[PDB]
Every structure is written in C-alpha cells, then in structure tokens.
C-alpha cells in the first residue's frame, strides 16, 4: 500500500520548451500541471524548482502568488564560525530534507487563490500554469557549444539533461520524486537543422510559420515520474536499428560509422532481457543518444538512454568492445527495473539496484561465460569487503540516524558520497545473488516477472493512481511476492545482509587426525573489527581428497571452534588411478609433493561465495599448488595465485609457469600468474638459475622460431594470447636484480618488442598493446642515485633512462601526428613521465601536465594530466598547484572533470589529518568550507565530493590547524 | 619517424622535459582542439 506524502495527486504534466538559445545558453518555457487535491483546504501547493526564474504562475487561469526559497544554496550561514564537518552534515541533511518532495515539502510554494477554495474543498481539478526561464544554467541542462564558427548545427552544439536521481528540478518545475507518476506531454521548439530527443513517442513534428524552427511533440502515456524525464537537443545523425525497428540511435555528426558498428549488438541484449523475464520491453520506442562532455558514462531514463561518445569504437578496436557492450547492457537493465518499476521511498532503492545489477550479471554470464561471471562476482565482493572494512559499512534498507559510523547522512541520495553510492549498488546486486542462492533462479525470475506483470497491468489504466502505484515496488511487497512464489521467506537472510550493515571475516586452519581419519577444521571469526559482524548460519566447505571432491555443511554457532568432518580412503595412491575432480572429469596428478598420511589435496571454505566474506585459510604450499593446477573453478585458481606469493619455493614457480603455458586455462588467471611469477622471482634472487622469468616463455609463445629476439608480426585475432602478450612484459618489467635495479636483459627485451612491432597485417588496432609497452617501460624505472641533491640535468642522466626517455618522446610526438583511438599512448606517456619525475630522473616540473590539462584536450588526457598534477602537489607540497586545482574545481566547463579532480584529490590527498604540513592554514580551511557551503551548490556531486575532501583532510572534528 | 618528429618539433611550438632542451628530446607542443572527439575516436586508416 502506497499513501502519498503530498496532499495532492498529479495526473498529467505538459512541458513546453521554446527559444533554446545556444549563444546565450538560455531556454524559455512553461509547465502546466494537472493536480487533484486529496485533502480539502489544500491552500499552498509545494513544487520543486532549482535555477529556474519563475515569471508567472496561474492556477485555473487565475493569478496566484508564489514564494521561492532554496535552503540548499548556502547550507550554513556565512557568519557562523563553525568549522567541524558533523555540523555541516547535519545542516546539509536538514536542508535537503527541507526541499524533499518525499516529505510534503518543496522549494516553490504557490498559494491557491481565495475564489478557488470552494473548488478545492470538494475535491476538483486544479491546472497550474507556471512559465519559467533558465538564464544561463550551472546544472541540469548542459550546453556543449564548440567555438568553431558557422551555424549551431554546423559547429556541433548540443544540449542534454545531466544529473543523478531527482535532478529534473534543475531544468523545469515539477514534483521531483520517484513516487509521483503522471502522464506526460513534451513539446520542444528547436532549430530546423536540429533534432530534439526525449521520452515517449514522437507523435508529430510541425514546422514554424517561417520554417526556420520546428516543434517536436512527444507523448508519454506510460505514467513515469518527473525524475525519469530527459532531453537531448542537437544536430544528431539518426540511425534506425536494422534489426529492431522501434529503436533509433542518435550520434554526433561525423560519427555515424562508429555508431553503426557500436550499436549493432543491442538487439541481442533486448532479446536476452525479454526472454529471461517474460515481459516485452514496456515502452513503445527506445532511443540511445551519444553526446559529448557527459555527466556519467551511461544514464538511463524512461524510454531513453544517454551515453557518452567515448564509448563509440570502430570494428578494429578491441579492449573497448566488452566495456561498451556491458554499458549498453546495464542501461537496458535499468530501463526494465529502474524506470518502469520505480521506487516507493528512498528506502527500497536496494531492491531496484539489486534487480538491475543481478539481471545484468545474468546477461554477463550468458554473453561472456560463467568464468567471466565468477571473476566479476569475486571482484565485486573484494571491492565491498575492502570498502566495508575501510569505513564502517553499507546499509541497504535503513529505517528512519541508522548509520552513524560515517560522515554523511544516508536519508537522501544527494547527501551520499559517490563511493558509497557505487558500493551501495554493488552490495545490492550481491545480496540479490544471495537471495537467488537461497531461493532458486527460476523462482527469482518468476518474482521479477510478477513485478513486471503487475506494473504492466497498472501501466494501461487511466485511474489517477488508484492503480498506478502498483508500478512502485517496496521491500515488503518484494518479500511478499517472493513468499508468494516460493513459500519460503528470506527474513533471516534479509535481517543479516540487508538490515545489519557488515561483512564477515573467516580465519581457518586445519589439522588431519590420522588415527580416526578425520579432518579437524578450526574456523574463527574476527567480529570486533569496525566493519565486521558475526555469522551464525551454515557454511559450505569443499574438500578435495584422493577419492574426489566432497562438500560438507558446517554449523558455525557463536561458541563453535573445532569442526570434525570425515575423510575418505587413500587407495588412489596405492594404484595409480586418476583422481576425480569437482566436475565429472578426472586427471593425473603428481602426488610426490603430497603428505603420505593425509588423503586430502585441498580445502576451500565457502567456495560458492554464499556469504559476504573474506577468507584467510592456512593450507600447505603444495595444497595451494594443487589448487592452482587442477581446480575447475576460477576463483579458487585466483585465490591460490594470491596465496602463492607467500611461498616462493621453486615448486610454486613451476606451478605458475605451468599455468602460464596452459591454454584452456581462463585468461584472467594467466594474467594474474604473470604478476605472481614476477613477485616470486623478485623474492628468490640469488637462487634463480637461468634467464629472467617469462622471457623464454615469451619467446616460446609470441616470437619467431628462427629468431628469438624478433617478435612475430602482430596478429591479434585470438583475443586471449593478445591479452596475455600485452600483459606479460608489464609484469616482466617488475623484475629486479640483487642491486634493486631492473636488469638490462628485460629492458633490452622490452625495447626490442617496441622496435620490431609491425601492425600492417592484422585487422585490429595496436593502441592498447603499444600503450601497455609504455606501461612496461614505466615499470622498469628504479629511483636514481642523486648525489648531494645534484640538479637533474641532461648530462647526468641514467644510461638506462635515456633510452626510455627517447622512446616515450618518440611515442608522444608520433601521437601528436598520428593519434590513437582514445589517446591511449598520450595517457601512457604522461603516466610514464610522471613515473620518471617521481624518481630523480626528470626535473619535477608540472608545466607539461598543466598544459595537457587545458579545456580543449580529450578527457582522458585531461584526467591523466590532472592525476599527475595531484601527485605532484602531494609530493612537492605545492601551494600554487593546490590553488590551481581548487580553481579548476570551481570553474571548469566539464562537470565530470570537476568531480574527477575532487575524487583524485580525495584518493591521493595533499595531506591527511595526522600530517603537519605547510598547507594547513586557516585560509585553506576557509576555502574548503566555502566550497562545501557555497560554490558547489549546483551539482549535488561536487558538494558530496567537497564533503569527502574536507573529511579526508581535516576529519570529523574541528580543523586542528586553526585558532 | 624520428626524422619526422624532430622536423615537426623544430618548426613549431615546442615543449621540453628539461630546462631549455630543444636539441635533445624535443616535444611537439600540445595544442587544444575545438572538437576533440573527432580527432580521438575516428579511425584514420580504413
């Protein structure tokens, strides 16, 4: 049951936009809402509006009086001397709650005229006509206007609606909540050479009487929220999908072949999401818009998605096809379960984020294989256990503070830190995988189909929300639908992993009792760390003995420590028979390293990742080597690679080398075995016999049979030896001699890989392989032996580093004339120059990176150069570079770059709270408090980034470096 | 390619990793584009 927090119900909204002026960056328009009051004596009506100048408001064609105030413009007063962050977080939460449409509130308060009170008490319709104007928007609509001359379509100027969550208040007045569903009528009067893309279906396109402008009329009969309404106006090249004909793809001019190749896969994503769920795609059209200077890499609205143009690749670009493919896939998953089925509160957001991430993981499983699915699930689980042990924990479904261990309030999406938002979505889809583990996948897809079917029977009624609230899901409704389809309720699993905000830590060690033939496990939990919680459920453990692989369920109550499980025979060591594996197959194992008295070959605690856990198991090194070689699970091979770094014995070198030589191993395991072999080789110097590690293996796999030092000409058509070939010198460059310097046998090998590179014969580009070659050249740089702080000049350069510097100079200059796909070699060469500057080789001068961080460059070059400037101002304690970065945060045209500068200055801070630094003035505290209070008031993501930066630099209490 | 890059760095605006370093390791100076996605994303040999 859904009861509105608003005293009115909104039925229909007309959004008309005229006069989109690109020179002056200005729009004019009106908005006409059709509300039905649910309570009599409505009097004031409270709507949401930011940055719009409200000209006039007429209610039922009668002139009404409005008052506007935004408390989130300046959160705390300018003349308050408070400088602690808990004060700002409480004031910011109160300010966002005072404009919240999820309460009754709002920023624009319109007073109902007196003569309509007899129209409002007996509950009859009210039609509110606001007309507004955005004079030069700092948020919401982003105007990308290039400085080439010509007409606005000839130079490539466009507008798009940017922002996250409820940010539609930034470009027209609305009820900007996900729970106020209404039908829509959208008119946009644009230039005759431009096209206006929006939500709904385009009913017509009429000309103006001078035929210089045309009006696009859109209609949206599926009741969506105001937060799902978008806009993209530009000189877009239109491409109808040749497979599905209601799907149109819009790109920027001159990028039509890239659009043709890139969006050619999307019909398979549509077919997948419509056959695992049994509902068809709910909207009547689908539109993909590719734009410049995007807010996020992929945004999903109702019947529309806005991607950045940096996803567009051609047919000869690999290492970008899977990333763009999965961006399209998660946009479509959010089309199904973020835009059609919406949110009932700010709680129950974990339901939608979990269903979107879970069905996108099912797509990844079918498309890229079960092994890529397991690797992705393991990397997401490692991400969340790192974040939750780092700071507190992520609390899905809080109850309204519920989480007081962290420096922001979790009551609203616009007060969350961006890393918390990312980990929120990550934990939501892993908890949905856990619900699939308890209640099987076919019942899970039946739950999702029941939600979609209730929403689509709801979506066709005309009753104003008598039935339109069946399109809003809640937690209680989701659990009730689960209990309807399965008969089991998941309330212990919901109580543990949703309502409780923690992950578990397992420390395991075994001992084999030879007398009674049992395996005595010893599993203890660390439940006193700040991020942890105590697990009391069951726990699966998989033991591989000589007779095969056996699963055991252990009951781990609070007082439990020793778990005795039984062991089988050892009669497959009496005769040589094959040892049967986890799957149905069996292999020949070399049992010379195994103990004579124990049959068990390896043990895995929680193999299926059925809890949110971090396992620290103490096996013997031969058990880790057997688990690396003969396991049929990629997460166990990865964890054995990760645990073999502590055992540098030559049997582990043989194990990793046999993994590296082995095709029919998953390629991301061999790419990890490269770096593990490099670390082991560095640890057993003065024992290593022959050549450096992986060199003979590289010449055996990727070089000519007649010439060992000449590499084969590039043929990248295998896509697994391409990735292994481009990752093996990067790990090989981490080799070090007894003198702690990279050997001149590996550096010469990398330089010969660079010289003899011929790419005139493959059908794929070479930009990522050459960029990884520059990364391998950067890995070999050891710190220089400066004497008496000698100035680093050209004559006293290292003889090794002069070759590296010549190569990166040649590569960067050749990129200036023949550019790569996304300037990958510019990014790699800037990263390598920063590596050479971090050691004492090149003079520590930020002027090159400051010239590459200007506005007109590509955004990857910009963020690489700004990363180099952030690293410089951390190491050299530069005041003027920090003022340069803070000025670039305040006034840069691209808001993604501002968010990225705040992000990089949070990750690599110039000082922490423990450090005494020269950059701990009252002036810097006043600048960052002014940046939290004012200055970042237009983005909701810059303000949370400024809160994160103030927390990283000065902590939760009063800045110490202050009177 | 070395001859081409030295010729293009000598007859234009130049940068340098070292102080006043034009003879050895000359860098072609970074110029901003008005539309950078066109020179980034588009293929040149097709």
């Amino acid at each position: 049951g859904f009861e509105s927090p608003r005293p009115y119900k909104l039925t229909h909204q007309v959004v008309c936009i005229n006069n989109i002026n690109f020179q002056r960056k200005s729009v004019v328009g009106f908005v006409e809402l059709t509300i039905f009051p649910t309570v009599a004596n409505l009097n004031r009506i409270k709507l949401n509006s930011k940055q719009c100048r409200i000209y006039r408001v007429r209610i039922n064609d009668l002139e009404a009086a409005f008052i506007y105030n935004d408390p989130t413009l300046e959160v705390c007063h300018s003349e308050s001397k408070q400088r602690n962050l808990n004060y700002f977080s409480n004031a910011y939460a109160a300010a966002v709650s005072a404009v919240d449409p999820d309460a009754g509130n709002g920023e624009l308060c319109i007073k109902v005229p007196s003569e309509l009170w007899k129209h409002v008490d007996e509950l009859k319709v009210l039609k509110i006509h606001i007309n507004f104007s955005l004079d030069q928007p700092k948020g919401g609509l982003h105007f990308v206007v290039p400085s080439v001359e010509g007409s606005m379509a000839e130079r490539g100027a466009h507008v798009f609606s940017c922002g996250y969550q409820n940010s539609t208040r930034f470009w027209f007045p609305c009820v900007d909540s996900y729970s106020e569903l209404c039908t829509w009528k959208l008119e946009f009067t644009v230039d005759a050479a431009m096209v206006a893309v929006s939500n709904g279906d385009l009913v017509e396109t009429v000309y103006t009487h001078d035929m210089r402008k045309k009006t696009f009329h859109y209609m949206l009969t599926i009741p969506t929220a105001a937060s799902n309404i978008s806009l993209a106006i530009g000189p877009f090249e239109i491409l109808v999908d040749p497979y599905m004909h209601e799907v149109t793809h819009f790109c920027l001019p001159q990028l039509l072949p890239l659009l043709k190749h890139t969006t050619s896969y999307l019909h398979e994503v549509f077919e997948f999401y419509e056959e695992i769920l049994t509902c068809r795609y709910p909207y009547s059209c689908f539109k993909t818009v590719f734009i410049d200077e995007a807010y996020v890499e992929v945004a999903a609205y109702a019947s529309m998605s806005i991607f950045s143009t940096n996803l567009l690749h051609s047919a000869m670009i690999i290492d970008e096809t899977p990333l763009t493919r999965r961006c399209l896939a998660q946009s479509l998953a959010q089309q199904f379960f973020g835009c059609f089925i919406s949110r009932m509160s700010w709680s129950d957001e974990w339901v939608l984020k979990g269903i979107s991430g879970y069905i996108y993981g099912l797509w990844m499983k079918k498309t890229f294989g079960v092994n890529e699915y397991r690797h992705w699930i393991k990397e997401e689980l490692d991400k969340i256990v790192a974040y939750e042990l780092k700071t507190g924990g992520v609390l899905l479904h809080p109850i309204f503070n519920p989480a007081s261990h962290l420096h922001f309030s979790i009551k609203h999406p616009h007060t969350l830190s961006w890393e918390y938002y990312s980990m929120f979505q990550c934990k939501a889809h892993l908890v949905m995988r856990l619900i699939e583990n308890r209640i099987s996948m076919e019942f899970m897809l039946q739950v999702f189909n029941k939600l979609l079917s209730l929403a689509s029977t709801a979506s066709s009624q005309k009753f104003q929300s008598h039935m339109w609230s069946q399109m809003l899901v809640s937690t209680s409704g989701f659990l009730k639908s689960i209990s309807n389809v399965s008969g089991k309720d998941i309330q212990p699993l919901i109580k543990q992993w949703v309502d409780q905000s923690g992950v578990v830590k397992f420390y395991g060690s075994f001992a084999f009792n030879r007398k009674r033939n049992v395996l005595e496990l010893e599993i203890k939990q660390d439940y006193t760390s700040p991020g942890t919680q105590k697990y009391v459920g069951p726990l699966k453990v998989t033991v591989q003995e000589l007779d095969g692989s056996f699963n055991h369920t252990l009951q781990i109550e609070e007082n439990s420590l020793k778990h005795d499980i039984p062991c089988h025979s050892k009669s497959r060591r009496n005769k040589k028979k094959k040892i049967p594996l986890m799957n149905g197959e069996e292999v020949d194992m070399d049992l010379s390293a195994m103990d004579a008295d124990s049959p068990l070959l390896w043990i895995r605690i929680d193999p299926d990742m059925s809890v949110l856990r971090k396992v620290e198991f103490e096996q013997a090194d031969f058990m880790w080597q057997y688990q690396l070689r003969y396991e049929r699970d990629v997460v166990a091979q990865q964890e054995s690679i990760l645990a073999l770094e502590k055992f540098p014995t030559p049997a582990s070198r043989l194990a990793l080398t046999d993994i590296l030589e082995q095709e029919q191993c998953f390629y991301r395991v061999r790419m990890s075995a490269c770096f593990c072999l490099a670390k082991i080789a560095n640890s057993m110097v003065s024992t290593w016999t022959g050549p450096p590690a992986m060199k003979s293996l590289f010449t055996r796999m990727f070089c000519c049979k007649s010439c060992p030092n000449i590499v084969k000409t590039n043929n990248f058509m295998s896509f697994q030896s391409y990735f292994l070939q481009k990752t093996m010198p990067v790990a090989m460059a981490l080799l070090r001699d007894v003198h702690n310097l990279c050997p001149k046998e590996v550096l010469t090998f990398i330089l010969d890989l660079i010289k003899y590179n011929d790419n005139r014969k493959n059908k794929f580009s070479d930009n990522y392989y050459r960029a990884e070659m520059i990364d391998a050249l950067a890995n070999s740089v050891t710190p220089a032996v400066s004497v008496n702080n000698e100035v680093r000049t050209l004559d006293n350069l290292n003889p090794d580093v002069r070759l590296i510097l010549e190569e990166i100079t040649r590569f960067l200059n050749m990129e200036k004339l023949l550019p790569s796909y996304r300037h990958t070699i510019t990014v790699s060469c800037l990263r390598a120059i920063r590596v050479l500057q971090k050691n004492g080789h090149v003079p520590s001068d930020p002027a090159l990176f400051k010239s590459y961080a200007e506005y007109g460059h590509f955004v990857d070059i910009r963020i690489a150069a700004l990363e180099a400037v952030v690293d410089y101002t951390k190491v050299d304690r530069s005041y003027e570079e920090l003022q340069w970065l803070l000025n670039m945060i305040q006034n840069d045209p691209v808001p993604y770059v501002r968010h990225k500068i705040l992000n990089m200055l949070t990750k690599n801070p110039p000082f922490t709270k423990n450090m005494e630094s020269p950059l701990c003035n009252e002036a810097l505290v006043d600048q960052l408090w002014k940046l939290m209070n004012s200055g970042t008031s237009h983005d909701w993501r810059l303000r949370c980034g400024a809160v994160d930066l103030y927390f990283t630099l000065f902590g939760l209490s009063r800045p110490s470096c202050l009177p | 390619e070395r001859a081409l890059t030295r010729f293009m760095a000598k007859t234009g605006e130049t940068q340098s990793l070292f102080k006043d370093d034009v003879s050895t390791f000359p860098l072609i100076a970074a110029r901003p584009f008005t539309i950078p996605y066109l020179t980034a994303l588009l293929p040149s040999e097709l």
Binding site: L818 | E1, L4, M8, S44
Partner: peptide
C-alpha cells in the same frame, strides 16, 4: 612499394 603513413607524412611535410 607504397610508402607507409609515417614516411608518407614525412614526404608530404
């Protein structure tokens, strides 16, 4: 027989 793009650009400049 046909100059590579590097030396084609060098010839042009």
């Amino acid at each position: 027989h046909e100059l590579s793009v590097e030396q084609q650009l060098y010839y042009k400049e």
